[PDB]
Design an enzyme around this catalytic site. Sequence first.
Site, mmCIF file in Angstrom:
data_model
loop_
_atom_site.group_PDB
_atom_site.id
_atom_site.type_symbol
_atom_site.label_atom_id
_atom_site.label_comp_id
_atom_site.label_asym_id
_atom_site.label_seq_id
_atom_site.Cartn_x
_atom_site.Cartn_y
_atom_site.Cartn_z
ATOM 1 N N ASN A 14 0.942 -1.349 0.056
ATOM 2 C CA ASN A 14 -0.046 0.204 0.064
ATOM 3 C C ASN A 14 0.876 1.213 -0.033
ATOM 4 O OD1 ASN A 14 -2.718 -1.073 0.070
ATOM 5 N ND2 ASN A 14 -2.114 -1.708 2.202
ATOM 6 N N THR A 46 8.508 -25.891 -29.994
ATOM 7 C CA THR A 46 7.463 -25.880 -29.590
ATOM 8 C C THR A 46 6.320 -25.766 -30.932
ATOM 9 O OG1 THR A 46 5.929 -23.761 -29.375
ATOM 10 C CG2 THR A 46 8.284 -23.509 -29.424
ATOM 11 N N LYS A 94 -0.721 -23.587 -34.954
ATOM 12 C CA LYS A 94 -1.351 -25.029 -35.531
ATOM 13 C C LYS A 94 -2.643 -25.423 -34.549
ATOM 14 C CE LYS A 94 -0.104 -25.925 -38.801
ATOM 15 N NZ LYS A 94 0.729 -24.512 -39.012
ATOM 16 N N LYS A 116 7.251 -28.793 -26.455
ATOM 17 C CA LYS A 116 6.422 -27.873 -25.581
ATOM 18 C C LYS A 116 4.932 -27.838 -25.932
ATOM 19 C CE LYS A 116 6.433 -24.174 -25.068
ATOM 20 N NZ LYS A 116 4.973 -24.164 -24.475
ATOM 21 N N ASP A 146 1.420 -24.893 -25.722
ATOM 22 C CA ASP A 146 1.029 -23.574 -26.019
ATOM 23 C C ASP A 146 0.639 -23.194 -24.658
ATOM 24 O OD1 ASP A 146 0.609 -21.123 -26.945
ATOM 25 O OD2 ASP A 146 -0.934 -21.737 -28.699
ATOM 26 N N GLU A 147 0.904 -22.032 -24.283
ATOM 27 C CA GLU A 147 0.486 -21.336 -22.916
ATOM 28 C C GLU A 147 -1.082 -21.383 -23.022
ATOM 29 O OE1 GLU A 147 2.934 -19.839 -24.759
ATOM 30 O OE2 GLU A 147 1.462 -18.659 -25.970
ATOM 31 N N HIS A 195 6.807 -21.330 -16.742
ATOM 32 C CA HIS A 195 6.683 -20.302 -18.021
ATOM 33 C C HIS A 195 6.326 -18.780 -17.301
ATOM 34 C CE1 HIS A 195 4.359 -18.659 -21.527
ATOM 35 N NE2 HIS A 195 5.536 -18.274 -21.884
ATOM 36 N N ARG A 196 6.699 -17.614 -18.060
ATOM 37 C CA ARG A 196 6.666 -16.565 -17.312
ATOM 38 C C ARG A 196 5.776 -15.492 -18.190
ATOM 39 N NH1 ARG A 196 12.044 -12.884 -18.632
ATOM 40 N NH2 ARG A 196 11.705 -12.942 -20.792
ATOM 41 N N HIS A 224 12.414 -19.158 -17.991
ATOM 42 C CA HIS A 224 12.703 -18.571 -19.408
ATOM 43 C C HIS A 224 13.417 -17.302 -19.098
ATOM 44 C CE1 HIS A 224 9.676 -21.019 -21.225
ATOM 45 N NE2 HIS A 224 9.898 -20.456 -22.628
ATOM 46 N N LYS A 276 21.135 -7.109 -28.630
ATOM 47 C CA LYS A 276 21.319 -6.101 -27.862
ATOM 48 C C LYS A 276 22.914 -5.263 -28.140
ATOM 49 C CE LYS A 276 19.553 -7.832 -23.926
ATOM 50 N NZ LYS A 276 18.100 -7.669 -23.337
ATOM 51 N N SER A 294 14.868 -18.537 -26.108
ATOM 52 C CA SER A 294 13.991 -18.663 -27.168
ATOM 53 C C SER A 294 13.388 -17.586 -27.821
ATOM 54 C CB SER A 294 12.787 -19.364 -26.676
ATOM 55 O OG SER A 294 12.130 -18.612 -25.856
HETATM 56 O O1 LIG Z 1 -3.701 -0.185 6.288
HETATM 57 C C1 LIG Z 1 -4.486 1.115 6.246
HETATM 58 O O2 LIG Z 1 -3.730 2.060 6.096
HETATM 59 C C2 LIG Z 1 -5.957 0.840 6.238
HETATM 60 O O3 LIG Z 1 -6.433 0.038 7.447
HETATM 61 C C3 LIG Z 1 -6.344 2.537 6.722
HETATM 62 O O4 LIG Z 1 -5.946 2.476 7.967
HETATM 63 P P1 LIG Z 1 -6.089 4.157 8.486
HETATM 64 O O5 LIG Z 1 -7.529 4.607 8.237
HETATM 65 O O6 LIG Z 1 -6.035 3.678 10.121
HETATM 66 O O7 LIG Z 1 -5.008 4.976 8.183
HETATM 67 C C4 LIG Z 1 -6.370 0.526 5.017
HETATM 68 O O8 LIG Z 1 -6.370 -0.777 4.786
HETATM 69 C C5 LIG Z 1 -6.286 1.489 3.673
HETATM 70 O O9 LIG Z 1 -6.849 2.718 3.572
HETATM 71 C C6 LIG Z 1 -5.907 0.358 2.562
HETATM 72 O O10 LIG Z 1 -6.278 1.438 1.625
HETATM 73 P P2 LIG Z 1 -7.047 1.018 0.152
HETATM 74 O O11 LIG Z 1 -8.572 1.331 0.639
HETATM 75 O O12 LIG Z 1 -6.714 2.129 -0.891
HETATM 76 O O13 LIG Z 1 -6.819 -0.445 -0.022
HETATM 77 MG MG LIG Z 2 -4.355 -1.996 6.823
#
Ligand SMILES: O=C(O)[C@@](O)(COP(=O)(O)O)[C@H](O)[C@H](O)COP(=O)(O)O
Ligand SMILES: [Mg+2]
Lengths: 452, 455, 118, 118
Positions: free
Chosen positions: B112, B162, B166, B190, B192-193, B283-284, B316, B323, B368
């Site tokens: 976050n 691969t 086809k 191989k 196909d993804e 595979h990525r 991969h 380059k 590849s």
């Molecule tokens: O972890 C935190 O910060 C919160 O509990 C807010 O805490 P406070 O309100 O105590 O700051 C929420 O999870 C965030 O708002 C997540 O954001 P979003 O809603 O964008 O996922």
């Molecule tokens: Mg939180």
Amino acid sequence: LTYYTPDYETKDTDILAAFRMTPQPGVPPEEAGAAVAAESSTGTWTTVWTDGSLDRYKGRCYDIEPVAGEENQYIAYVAYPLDLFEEGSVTNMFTSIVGNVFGFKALRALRLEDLRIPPAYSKTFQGPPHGIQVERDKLNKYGRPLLGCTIKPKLGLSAKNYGRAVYECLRGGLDFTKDDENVNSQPFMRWRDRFLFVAEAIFKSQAETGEIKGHYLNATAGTCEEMMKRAQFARELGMPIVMHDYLTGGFTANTTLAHYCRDNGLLLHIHRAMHAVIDRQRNHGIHFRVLAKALRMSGGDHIHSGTVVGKLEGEREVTLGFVDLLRDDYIEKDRSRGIYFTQDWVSMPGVLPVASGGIHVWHMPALTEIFGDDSVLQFGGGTLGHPWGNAPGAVANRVALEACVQARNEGRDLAREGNDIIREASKWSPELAAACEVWKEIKFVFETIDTL
Amino acid sequence: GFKAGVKDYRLTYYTPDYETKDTDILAAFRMTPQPGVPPEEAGAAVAAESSTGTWTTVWTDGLTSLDRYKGRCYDIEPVAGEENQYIAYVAYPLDLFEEGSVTNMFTSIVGNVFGFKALRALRLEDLRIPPAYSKTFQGPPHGIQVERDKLNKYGRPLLGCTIKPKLGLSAKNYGRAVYECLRGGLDFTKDDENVNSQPFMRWRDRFLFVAEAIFKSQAETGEIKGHYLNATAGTCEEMMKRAQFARELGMPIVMHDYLTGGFTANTTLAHYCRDNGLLLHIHRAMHAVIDRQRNHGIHFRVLAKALRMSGGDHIHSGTVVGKLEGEREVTLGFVDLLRDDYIEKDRSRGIYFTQDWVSMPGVLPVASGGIHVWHMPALTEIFGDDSVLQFGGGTLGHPWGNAPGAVANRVALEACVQARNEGRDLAREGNDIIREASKWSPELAAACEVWKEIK
Amino acid sequence: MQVWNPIDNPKFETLSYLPPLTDNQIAREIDYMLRNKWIPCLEFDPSGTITTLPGQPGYYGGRYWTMWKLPMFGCNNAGYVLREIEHCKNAYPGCFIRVLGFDNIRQVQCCAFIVHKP
Amino acid sequence: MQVWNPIDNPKFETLSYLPPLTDNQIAREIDYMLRNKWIPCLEFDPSGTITTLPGQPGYYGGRYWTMWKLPMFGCNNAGYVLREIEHCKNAYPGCFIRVLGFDNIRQVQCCAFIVHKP
Ligand SMILES: O=C(O)[C@@](O)(COP(=O)(O)O)[C@H](O)[C@H](O)COP(=O)(O)O
Ligand SMILES: [Mg+2]
């Protein structure tokens, strides 16, 4: 000229998508549109490899528009046949549409904006476990938005202490409580004791006031067996709701859990973690509305939608559009809010939105207007940072909401006359007065990076 | 003791003078803040909202003792050239993480903080894992040496191909092509993804026909052959069913997608594969949505380290010949991060911390994407004989069919290996050695004509 | 600081934290309900206890009440509703009384509050 | 419309909704019973509560009573039955009293009703 059919009459069982593209200097536009269609399907414009019916397994571009205000920006539309996808699998759909088109060198950037899912493909999914009406009927709560709170500090508190705070917070007037998203099982506190203490606190608080209460228990784990073990205990104790993170856990695990919750009658709460790594820049990634549609198809009851006046980014019109996409049943095309296609959900339940992230009492009138009485509002530092305690903090939050609801019903404004409402209420509430004096001048205003 | 109100972050989360311990986790982001905020506050804010911190002072903290569960920024360096870029360094206590879980580790560091209204961009670059958090993981199921012992192949890189454009083909036509290619002389084959289960072809009969083809191709040559079978699904009950059937038929290898499927399912599959004796191919897909732009996202060298701890055998990695100098150093560095056992610090190669793996097995890299016969000595001289080379249109495009297509590749590879084992230089001679081998093999001719020389 | 009283302090959901309601306030929501085209209805019960079960999530006892007569379909004036309340109060003077509302388009209630206590 | 009182309104199965029964009515069913060759019997108990169990279908508590003396086999006049009722009423004046009947061919009861209340 081939993967670009400028007349194709889109059928009613096809999937449509819209990209915004930034070509390199020189590359003609109607040429790049045809390269995205092929590079997302077969990878050719010739027939040297077919003659083995093809054609019935290829995507085609059928429209191109220029973006107003920018000299190098375009919108491309692509149609995909129905027989390319496996029924009941979001993993496949995501792998088939986006899994190679974002490394093309002839381009500089790419962003997916919207998708149209036909009713012939939506009927093969289960959807939300319960929905909106069923949850309200179960909880017996009508006429106003719900309230909640998260516990802090994150990491450091024991299990007895964690439970002592839930009770005081719950006994004050709130409805729900939640665990932080980064709390699964750590050396300072293991899960099986936290569950027991939380259950005891919930029972004691419920016996006192006389209303139904709950708490979201985290069930994210490192393996599927542990994740399924942590839910059977919650079923045994009789708790009503659980929580899961669906972006760092996976779509395969989320679908397995949704099935279990539908089978055993629980409620599911979803958290959107790591999403800002994909949808923050306005020229690369995937917009959030696509992920919201995908989650509604996969299964869930709640979802975080963000605020517009907190510590994290978020615009108004855009939000008003996706919230409508999440809750409604039939949505019309509207380009002034970021909607590109008309959507039909053929009787599929809705999802409750949630707002959280740095908010206090001087923000209630606004929230109550952006969202109706069909949402949940969360306050973590606004309750545990009150000069007195957790019970006095919870009472102040409920009184403000009740006053706002009454004022709205009496036929008064809320954007023009909001500060007054709060003041006239503090005249008879000794707890609301204290809170207003602590957070008078604390706002968040910066330049938006994802305008539109 | 309690003072309700709001304060700054640089008052408790900026420790300019801190000595890191040997059980700590370190990170390094590059940041670009908004006009108004000094760099110090920015760094401190990241550390706070990722360990233990809010925005308005709580009272329940005077009963837990911080200064023991908090993260700290301990260095900030400006970036040359750019005007508003800096590198930060954060330290994380060991007691914050759950043992054996990659999901938890990620949810905390990147969760976050990439969406705060006081920044404009962010990007994670590197991570240092202490040798006390790694010992709680399992790692790759088998490794490098054990797989080579199982397959009984020494001295040269392995080959594969691969099934290119086809689709819409029935199962029998799929099996016929697989048998032809395997009889040609290759090793792996191989899928196909984008092929799990569709109305034109379900999975059980495709498994049956591929298994029928493998044995009959194996009998005529007396060498071990295999084919990757896709096991990605929508729930965890379907994936386990497909893996169990693949084991029942006696196949040696499976394949999974780990970016669009998730970490939890990948860990479960790795545990099952270790328990029942199978090989895992990774595979990525969708990776380009994260690690392409230079000022936002997550670099690939972190996802590589995460894949090594969750578990896998092949991965991969892309090609490194189109380059130029300066570049391809990053690729050579993060290949070493995948194969070696002790890597030292080197800023010129994009390495920020010294990494020790305390006896964990390695992972075979895979290259590849558009390659033909004339590229063989370069790939042999760059990677060495510890990789897998995958050919696409360079095998099914031969004018004579599918079976003669593999003979040319086999002959060219053997010639290149023989030339290397004699002292001749594989970089300067190059185009010359292929011509001599083409003289006494009609299949290498008529293929050295469709595909021209390098320069 | 002051302390919230924990002894003998029951609450009755919506609009229970605001100061007591007056008859003007009462005949103000009934109008808000009517302006949006909803059907009123009355309910009564002599107790408000809640009971749970050992191991059944989502089951509680004490959620249903008794319906007065029938939903007032096709009602366009408030006065009528207020008279019906006085009749109910006269009939049973030892029970709680509640007022509800109904939406037939989404099939769901819209509001509820208490108007009489023993 | 009128409302059915929900408060303190117990019922006792058959013939509890019709107006109270008189002695003529009583000595009218006893005769109907005798005309079909059935066997009378009396039962008494001081309570009428019903109790259930957590998870056992078809189990209830409070179905058995106490038998007065023995079934009146070989009885051809009603008078005798009425005298026995007065004896039982005199003996225990704080209990309910019931009258039963029996068919030995299908092995089942045929009627039951209450004749005294506390
Ligand atoms: O972890 C935190 O910060 C919160 O509990 C807010 O805490 P406070 O309100 O105590 O700051 C929420 O999870 C965030 O708002 C997540 O954001 P979003 O809603 O964008 O996922
Ligand atoms: Mg939180």
